[PDB]
Design a protein around this nucleic acid. Structure first.
Ligand SMILES: [Mg+2]
Ligand SMILES: [Zn+2]
Ligand SMILES: [Zn+2]
Lengths: 50, 1358, 49
RNA sequence: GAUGUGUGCU
DNA sequence: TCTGAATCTCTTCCAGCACACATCAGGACGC
DNA sequence: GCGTCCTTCGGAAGAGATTCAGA
């Protein structure tokens, strides 16, 4: 489940609260995008490697 | 001689009093001329002489020097028998800890000083110091100091302060303890502190301190200072073949202990460095530990072959200890053993001994009579004459063997009938001939089993074997009123083939004047044994007061039944043989013969049935061929239909309609249905397909196929074995209890494939590995059942009360499984029973209702009899005769002074073991029913739906929304006749009040996956269900529908365990809906494996399904897998989800909201209201905020726990629940057990009773004491002006209640010998030798049967 | 068309001891285990037959 | 006397 | 921060009788 | 031929000791 508004290159791909169905992954592969925005609050559930 | 046994601690002064010398050297026999060493474990100076009346060095030789002690070696010349009576002792250089008071858990040292076990074991095994006499510093009296901390304490406080370490420190701690000051301080703390856990710990320590201060014991004796040694004769070093000796365990342990002690003493004499002597003290402590109780420490030492050797505790505790191996059972002289053969020419009071066994058995008797007649002169001459087996010895053997009964005994003696007494008949050979009429009771098949004989020596033993244990007087099993001498497997076949008719014969329509001419016809062959003639018989009747009145009639019978009537005793009605006599028919015939005539006619008639069954079975030639099992011509159509339906099930589960477990539950369903259809079709085709002409056209008769004869007569067989011989073998089960998904489709008459045989191997191994590896946990049940009921014996003629359980005939889902007659028979009623001729009594208040009374109760259609139960009796240390009933083995009231606890425990405990060594007889078949999912009522009448919460469905028909419902069908009279259990979420085509016609369907449902349903319709919002965290959601992309499965508490995320899935109902505006009756929202909780095929906010109708949960109803349901339930009930295990009850009556309402979970307060209208309860949110509440609830009503749903039901609904309700559940479990396998035994066990459950308030008694507040003591004290106080003490019955399991028995010897002999012996030594208990096992161990007349009068005389003499 | 292996003979399932029972495919395996054991425990007679 | 293995009946 | 409920950890138990065979008993090192 | 000596591996349940949480 997307904890925030999934978007890339400005346009929004998956709305907030909506699950990422396989068509979304396929379309994101087709668009060929890697860099996305994210609120800093989502970093709270992350652990540093080194 | 003595009347008590006292157990307590041993003082060093007392051990030295036991001590006769001081052993200080580990020198056994010197590997030379076999003399004991000077100061070793074996020595004549310390313990006693080796040879009888002889000195060690050889200064005295005969009795004329008895008493003097020699000079050269200092030994006494006395008996050599005293080597097993005169103990030595060891003077240890350093003290050591006795482990039984250290590691009992509860550790006595641990809770005596309130310091944990770990600190004490670290101190006693030299890892840390401990503080004694803290004094003028900050160190407490029990502080633990490590090595560095102790060094710091000495460098800063090296004053008169002391801090010891090891066993000496613990001895100082215990010696410097004041019991009275600690006791009063703990009493003050108990009075002050309000917490419950510290209260329990404090009261436990107070109990221990009270046990110390009451007896003469003292805390410092629990640390060993002197170590007594076992006498040498009880640890013998037998001289083997050669120069080596036996590797006796105790000798090696004593050698090691003496080594450590002597080395420690030598080091202490030489002033060794402190670390070395500390290590050697550790070695001494661990050596003494290994000697006392080996294996309780971390590692158990071994001497050779790396095998844990036994200490002084392994031979007192366990299966190989003295209590179970050499005290409760011993090897016995005057015994024999041989393989048994039939010899059917015998009688019930006769057995067959080999001619050579009787000469070795009755050898002293032969010696005595040879000396009496003067044929011999001395004992050795008679011995030589017997060994030479002279002709005179054979003549005189027939004299001693005449009327001296012996004890025939089998190896597994499951029940009371395992030992029966027969007179011997001397025959040649080497085999023990056995009368086949008792082989069913013995369970002694003739396939190579060994029985054991025993010779009653004394006069009383012979008379007991003649009057009590004789097989003639043992024709009624103690389990039930059915006879135990049932003909079987040849006699049943012979009688059934004789007492049968077919329409043709050599002579058919002829007339005879009696049985004699029928015999003349059959012997001459002028009329077949299956004719249909009209003989003239003279049957007798005893309508008068014991006088037989004659009558003569002309009845239409066969030749065979006429012949059989010749042996029927004068007095039975002829309408007992005028049918096809199977096994149950002749069992009922023998039963009614016993009930009407008596014992001698019954035994004579049983022998005559034996003879006339064997003769006409030999003459019958009822063989078996390969042309007798006929294959039905429609079984393959049934397997084709079942294959089509399971192929439909394939598409059903692969699509997603049902899951893997549901598919497995439905496939077994359809295979079992097909198996049941094939069995019935084959049975019909094999029992009716025969053609015969009556001198005209063809007529149908009951078939004469041999297999049908031996499957209908019931001689040996059932539906299962023959069903597998022809048609469908069925589906078999794995050893774990699961059933194979594929049943093999073939029969043994046609053959098996190379793969179907591999599949049937699963069931074949299941049966055997189930017998041999799960009869252990069924013999354990009967062991710990005989243990818990050994001390219960009838002691009084009548307790004279009015209390008694309420007795009803049970109908639990089918027809009348057991009626009133089979249930109340042979039990004394508790009050004047009211017939439906009300305001008038039918049966008096204290009449033992026999068969005539049972018939009278059946005639007037009585459905509610108040009967006296053995659990409600009022006697002390036993039960009165009237609260039990009949002997169940004789046709009269039970005799006062009979051990019924043992016959109850054995009767309960050996259908399980017997039938669990029988599941391989049918092969390996699952034998699982078809799990019917519909209600086909048969009888005509109305419906009384009790405790039903039904709702309206979208179709309009009633749907049940309650779990404790039952649909009872009652006929037009109003008496109860039928009762079916409808399940949750079932639709009803009818209701209550309407007279339902006989032969319709009223209820339908789905067997697997019982559904949760709703009361009010509306839209459902998916609350607390996010995909992945708590629910697995799968969705098809094309259609877009969610069919999710929820997770358990197992596979769910750890963080998300606080998230609980549920479906909340909302309206079009999303507002809160309400349950009809209250204002609380419709929060329908979802359990695990709940599948939902809906969408959020969909429009539904009221009373529809919402989710499905699989049931996983899988199992063979045999007595092997299916009886842990009896163990759970008897040991009283708390169920996993106990249904909370209403502990007090009054109005019901909530108090605080969400004190973690839900809360509820019950308040009465008159009394105080301090009761609150904690309600986890798992279970919905069947009550609301505005009703009145009574004591015992279920707040929630689930299985009842056999503690709260007792504490709330009383003794009668819990005993009836236990009786009903155990009876259903046993009747599921066809066993017939009388309920009296179960009530005896339940009464043995209730012996402990915690005190509510002290009152005027001397008992403490929370102390748990015997209920008999409480009753006696209350009855004594009520005779005075005081007031009795209020109590409450507790319910501990059979193991728990047996381990806490007042006589410590029983508990010590049963289980946990260390934990019981330590408790008895600490408490200083005093056994009274009151029960049966105590007198068995001591070796007296048990106060059970014939010795009960002697025990009464011995008790009343003091 | 899908198979690629076939059993050598029917006798390969059972041991050497249990293979000596004739008509084994009609006996139940429960009475085949004991039959194999009591064939294992036989004693040689005087004139072998 | 104790361990180890095999076996019979339940 | 005290005190019940839940969990961790230690101990007990596991059918009865019988028969046959074997080994084994300190075995390592010095004399 | 004499003779004296210093491995793990069950599993069902009960109880007694810890930890948790929770108000
Ligand atoms: Mg048998
Ligand atoms: Zn002497
Ligand atoms: Zn009574």
């Amino acid at each position: 489940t997307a904890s925030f508004d999934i978007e890339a290159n400005g346009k929004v791909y998956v709305e907030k609260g909506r699950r990422i169905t396989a068509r979304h992954i396929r379309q994101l592969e087709k668009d060929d995008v890697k860099l996305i925005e994210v609120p800093v609050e989502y970093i709270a559930g992350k652990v540093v490697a080194k | 001689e003595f009347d008590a046994i006292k157990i307590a601690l041993a003082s060093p002064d007392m051990i030295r009093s036991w001590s006769f010398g001081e052993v200080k050297k580990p020198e056994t026999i010197n590997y030379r001329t076999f003399k004991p060493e000077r100061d070793g474990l074996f020595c004549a100076r310390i313990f006693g002489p080796v040879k009888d009346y002889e000195c060690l060095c050889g200064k005295y030789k005969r009795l004329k020097h008895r008493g003097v002690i020699c000079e050269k070696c200092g030994v006494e010349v006395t008996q050599t028998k005293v080597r097993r009576e005169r103990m030595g002792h060891i003077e240890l250089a350093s003290p050591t800890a006795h482990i039984w008071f250290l590691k009992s858990l509860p550790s006595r040292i641990g809770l005596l000083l309130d310091m944990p076990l770990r600190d004490i074991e670290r101190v006693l095994y030299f890892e840390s110091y401990v503080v004694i006499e803290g004094g003028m510093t900050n160190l407490e009296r029990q502080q633990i100091l490590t090595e560095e901390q102790y060094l710091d304490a000495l460098e800063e406080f090296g004053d008169e302060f002391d801090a010891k370490m090891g066993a000496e420190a613990i001895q100082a701690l215990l010696k410097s303890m004041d019991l009275e000051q600690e006791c009063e301080q703990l009493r003050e703390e108990l009075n002050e502190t309000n917490s419950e856990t510290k209260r329990k710990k404090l009261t436990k320590r107070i109990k221990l301190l009270e046990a110390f201060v009451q007896s003469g014991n003292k805390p410092e004796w629990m640390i060993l200072t002197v170590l007594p040694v076992l006498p040498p004769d009880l640890r013998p070093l037998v001289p083997l073949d050669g120069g080596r000796f036996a590797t006796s365990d105790l000798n090696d342990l004593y050698r090691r202990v003496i080594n450590r002690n002597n080395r420690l003493k030598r080091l202490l004499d030489l002033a060794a460095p402190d670390i070395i002597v500390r290590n050697e003290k550790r070695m001494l402590q661990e050596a003494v530990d290994a000697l006392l109780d080996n294996g309780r420490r971390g590692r158990a030492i071994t001497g050779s072959n790396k095998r844990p050797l036994k200490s002084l505790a392994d031979m007192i505790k366990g299966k190989q200890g003295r209590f179970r191996q050499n005290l409760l059972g011993k090897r016995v002289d005057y015994s024999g053993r041989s393989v048994i053969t039939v010899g059917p020419y015998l009688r019930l009071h006769q057995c067959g001994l080999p001619k050579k066994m009787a000469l070795e058995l009755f050898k002293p008797f032969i010696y005595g009579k040879l000396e009496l007649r003067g044929l011999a002169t001395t004992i050795k001459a008679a011995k030589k004459m017997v060994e030479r087996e002279e002709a005179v010895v054979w003549d005189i053997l027939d004299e001693v063997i005449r009327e001296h009964p012996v004890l025939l005994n089998r190896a597994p003696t499951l029940h009371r009938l395992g030992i029966q007494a027969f007179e011997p008949v001397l025959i040649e050979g080497k085999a023990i001939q056995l009368h086949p009429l008792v082989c069913a009771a013995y369970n002694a098949d003739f396939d190579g089993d060994q029985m054991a004989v025993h010779v009653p020596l004394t006069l009383e033993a012979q008379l007991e074997a003649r009057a009590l244990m004789m097989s003639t007087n043992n024709i009624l099993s103690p389990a039930n009123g059915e006879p135990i001498i049932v003909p079987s497997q040849d006699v049943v076949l012979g009688l059934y083939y004789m007492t049968r008719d077919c329409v043709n014969a050599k002579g058919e329509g002829m007339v005879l004047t009696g049985p004699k001419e029928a015999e003349r016809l059959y012997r001459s062959g002028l009329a077949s044994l299956h004719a249909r003639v009209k003989v003239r018989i003279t049957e007798y009747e005893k309508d008068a007061n014991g006088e037989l009145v004659a009558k003569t009639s002309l009845k239409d019978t066969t030749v065979g039944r006429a012949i059989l009537w010749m042996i029927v005793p004068k007095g039975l009605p002829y309408s007992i043989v005028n049918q096809a006599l199977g096994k149950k028919a002749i069992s009922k015939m023998l039963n009614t013969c016993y009930r009407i005539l008596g014992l001698k006619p019954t035994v004579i008639f049983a022998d005559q049935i034996m003879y006339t069954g064997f003769a006409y079975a030999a003459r019958s030639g009822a063989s078996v061929g390969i042309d007798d099992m006929v294959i039905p011509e429609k079984k393959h159509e049934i397997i084709s239909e079942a294959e089509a339906e399971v192929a439909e099930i394939q598409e059903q589960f692969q699509s997603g309609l049902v899951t893997a477990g549901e598919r497995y539950n439905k496939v077994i369903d359809i295979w079992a249905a097909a198996n049941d259809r094939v069995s019935k079709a084959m049975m019909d085709n094999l029992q009716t397909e025969t053609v015969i002409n009556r001198d005209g056209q063809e007529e149908k008769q009951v078939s004469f196929n041999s297999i049908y004869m031996m499957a209908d007569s019931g001689a040996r067989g059932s539906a299962a074995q023959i069903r597998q011989l022809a048609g469908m073998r069925g589906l078999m089960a794995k050893p774990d209890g699961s059933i194979i998904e594929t049943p093999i489709t073939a029969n043994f008459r046609e053959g098996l494939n190379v793969l179907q045989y591999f599949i049937s191997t699963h069931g074949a191994r299941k049966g055997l590995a189930d017998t041999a590896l799960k009869t252990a946990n069924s013999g354990y049940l009967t062991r710990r059942l005989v243990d818990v009921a050994q001390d219960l014996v009838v002691t009084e003629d009548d307790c004279g009360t009015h209390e008694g359980i309420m007795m009803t005939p049970v109908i639990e889902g089918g027809d009348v499984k057991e009626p009133l007659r089979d249930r109340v028979l042979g039990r004394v009623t508790a009050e004047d029973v009211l017939k439906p001729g009300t305001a008038d009594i039918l049966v008096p208040r204290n009449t033992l209702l026999h068969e005539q009374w049972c018939d009278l109760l059946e005639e007037n259609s009585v459905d509610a009899v108040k009967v006296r139960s053995v659990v409600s009796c009022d006697t002390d240390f036993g039960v009165c005769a009237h609260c039990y009933g009949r002997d169940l083995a004789r046709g009269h009231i039970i005799n006062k002074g009979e051990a019924i606890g043992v016959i109850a425990a054995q009767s309960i405990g050996e259908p399980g073991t017997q039938l669990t060594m029988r599941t391989f007889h049918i092969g390996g078949a699952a034998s699982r029913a078809a799990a019917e999912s519909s209600i086909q009522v048969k009888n005509k009448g109305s419906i009384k739906l009790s405790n039903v919460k039904s709702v309206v469905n979208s179709s309009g028909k009633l749907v049940i929304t309650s779990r404790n419902t039952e649909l009872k069908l009652i006929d037009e009279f109003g008496r109860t006749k039928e009762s079916y259990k409808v399940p949750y979420g079932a639709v009803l085509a009818k209701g209550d009040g309407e007279q339902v016609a006989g032969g319709e369907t009223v209820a339908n449902w789905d067997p697997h996956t019982m559904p949760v349903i709703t009361e009010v319709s509306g839209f459902v919002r998916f609350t607390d269900m996010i995909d992945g965290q708590t629910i697995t959601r799968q969705t098809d992309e094309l259609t877009g529908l969610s069919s999710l499965v929820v997770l358990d508490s197992a596979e769910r995320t750890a963080g998300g365990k606080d998230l609980r899935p549920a479906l909340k109902i909302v309206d079009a505006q999303g507002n809160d809906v309400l349950i009809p009756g209250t204002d609380m929202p419709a929060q329908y909780f979802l359990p695990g494996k709940a599948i939902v095929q809906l969408e959020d906010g969909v429009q539904i109708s009221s009373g529809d399904t919402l989710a499905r949960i699989p049931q996983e109803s899988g199992g063979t349901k045999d007595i092997t897998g299916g009886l842990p339930r009896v163990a759970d009930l008897f040991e009283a295990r708390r169920p996993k989800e106990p249904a909370i009850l209403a502990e007090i009556s009054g109005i019901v309402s909530f108090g605080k909201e969400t004190k973690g979970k839900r809360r509820l307060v019950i308040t009465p209208v008159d009394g105080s209201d301090p009761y609150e309860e904690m309600i986890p949110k798992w279970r919905q509440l069947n009550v609301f905020e505005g009703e009145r609830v009574e004591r015992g009503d279920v707040i929630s749903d689930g299985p009842e726990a056999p503690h709260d039901i007792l504490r709330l609904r009383g003794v009668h309700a819990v005993t009836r629940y236990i009786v009903n559940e155990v009876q259903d479990v046993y009747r599921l396998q066809g066993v017939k057990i009388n309920d009296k035994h179960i009530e005896v066990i339940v009464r043995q459950m209730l012996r402990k009773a915690t005190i509510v308030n002290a009152g005027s008694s001397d008992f403490l507040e929370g102390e748990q004491v015997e209920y008999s003591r409480v009753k006696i004290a209350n009855r004594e106080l009520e005779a005075n002006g005081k007031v009795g003490a209020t109590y409450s019955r507790d319910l501990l399991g059979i193991t728990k209640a047996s381990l806490a028995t007042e006589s410590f010897i029983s508990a010590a002999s049963f289980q946990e010998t260390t934990r019981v012996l330590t408790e008895a030594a600490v408490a200083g208990k005093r056994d009274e030798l009151r029960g049966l096992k105590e007198n068995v161990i001591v070796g007296r007349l048990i106060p059970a049967g014939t010795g009960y009068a002697y025990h009464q005389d011995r008790m009343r003499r003091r | 068309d899908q198979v690629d292996y076939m059993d050598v003979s029917t006798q390969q399932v059972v041991s050497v001891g249990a293979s000596l029972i004739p008509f084994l495919e009609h006996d139940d395996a429960n009475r085949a285990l004991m039959g194999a054991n009591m064939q294992r425990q036989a004693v040689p007679t005087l004139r072998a037959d």
